[model samples]
Target: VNSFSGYLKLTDNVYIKNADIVEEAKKVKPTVVVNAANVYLKHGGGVAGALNKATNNAMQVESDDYIATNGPLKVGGSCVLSGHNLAKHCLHVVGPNVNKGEDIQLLKSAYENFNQHEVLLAPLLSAGIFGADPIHSLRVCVDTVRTNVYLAVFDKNLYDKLVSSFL
Candidate 1:
């Protein structure tokens, strides 16, 4: 071990779990499951796709209804909507797609949108196909999330990256 001096403290511990967010989210009672959604609310792939499929694709219908009424959710925008079978209420957040000229602030905003005090079963929002870059998003999750979160990371490389970020 290397000698170290005084260090700063991060806000919260990201309790990362290796299981799938959707499957694990089902075990929790609050039903406040989080969906990493696109600006258009399309559950095409990644976290949204899994959740949409778990709910027999009814999730899309719900999102479509939301879009029809409220228009597309802007990057960094968030909303609470009805969860059909998978949950009682689902928190939808449109993260910044880094590949599309979006910034890290949008990702931070997206994470901050959820209540840190509540049992939030969320994934690494924007780290998936949205291409928020896992290296950056993981740090953001740890910094922004204040309390309880069952973080699900599917890929070994991503998980390794998370572990390595510490020491």
Candidate 2:
């Protein structure tokens, strides 16, 4: 349903692309690819699923078993899992249940939870499945990302909204 292609510069190193997250991961080959998911790390859909598939489903096993006993992972917390066949590692961050109008500071916190990497690939966290505004989420990412970040956007409406905001 979407056919847009190209990248937007958010900073000297931060970029947003209208492309597949998994494909971008392969291209960018970042040290870590941030996966937006819940505490349980069930990657049944969205960015999570794509990353899960990319990693050959290695991420799901650890998070599900650990969280079942250790309790749910905090919204701003993150878990680093083996990327296996993808990148060197995969950073899984719990997405916030954000509203339409408010700025979700927790989203920024999630971005900060990463241990430290030179390059990281990320999805537009909380903007899709979590129902937050993509523009607001983008703002959070631009502010939060410390290292070089490649943000992948697959949805047409999200891409258009981001471009319009810049105009």
Candidate 3:
């Protein structure tokens, strides 16, 4: 806990099961924030450059706010994106290439920078195992943190699973 990246610490009871990072984020108050993925479309496929353009067009840039934006939070890069609406401010960092093994570091980084109201909403990309669709993968992602999720899609399976986790 000495460096800038020192926030990457996990305490007992903290679990990173599904893509419930947003839900988990609501439990704590934080100063800094990061959002690794942006649910751009229904099925989660959008151009990185277009994302940058769209974000610039409508959404408030992380730089315009009081909070400082950091890292390669862009369309083609591998840095985390953070802000108010984790969806709006954050870019889609995950692609077909990202894997669960690599996401641990991203998840770790997101947890470290958790803010009270600040959230890091991202779909569980790799949860689908292989080349399954995002919906199926989202199912796997949602199951992990159903108990803590604040803004999850209203999928019956997801809804049911999340409820059980917290109870």
Candidate 4:
């Protein structure tokens, strides 16, 4: 029920595309894939669950097992789980809600959690259930992404909403 509307090139190495990241990953696995996360880092519902099923719930089992022993991953942090044959691993980020005063810095920290790879794929972070202003978050996202990352935006209108000068 979707089509690739090409990519909105936000920077030299970063771009936005209208595609299901899980499906896209299946065709061309990025070095790292990211998904939204609760502070507990549970991969249930939304994009998280989608990625879970992508790997036959293997990633979910590891997620549940990790948190059961290591404590919550916390806001402004992330954790990586394996077995998403779609990609090397799935990076789960615990982003802050725009409702919080510290959301800006917290959001920055989340993006900073893992930037050591090329070919990263992630849904535009902080703008979904995390309640971040799409435009504002888009700016921060582009600023923080260090690799040639693909920021997937599936909503038809938001795909157009992403049309702007990020410089």
lDDT (0 to 1) per candidate: 0.75, 0.74, 0.33, 0.75
TM values, all candidates: 0.85, 0.82, 0.32, 0.86
**Count of clashing residue pairs in every prediction:** 0, 0, 10, 0
Candidate 4 lDDT by residue in tens digits, 131-161: 7877777777777878677787777688777
What C-alpha lDDT does candidate 1 achieve relative to the native structure? Answer: 0.75
Off by over 4 Å in 3: 1-71, 74-105, 116-149
- Model 3 C-alpha lDDT per residue in residues 1-167, reported as the tens digit of each score: 11111121122222223323443334332232233333231112222323334344333354333124333232223333343432424433333334323433333223222222233333334323223344444334343332222232223475446445442
Cα error, residue 129 of model 1, in Å, equals: 0.4
lDDT of 2 by residue, 1-167 (tens): 11223667768667787878888777656678788877667788888887777767777776677678787778877777776666778888886856433347777887776537677777878878787878887777777777777778888777877967952
Q: Please tell me which model should have the higher TM-score, number 3 or number 4.
A: 4
Q: After superposing candidate 1, which stretches have Cα over 4 Å from the reference?
A: 1-13
Evaluated with TM-score, which candidate comes out highest? 4
Ranking of models by lDDT = 1, 4, 2, 3
> Candidate 4: worst 10 consecutive residues by lDDT?
1-10
- Of 1 and 4, which scores higher on TM-score? 4
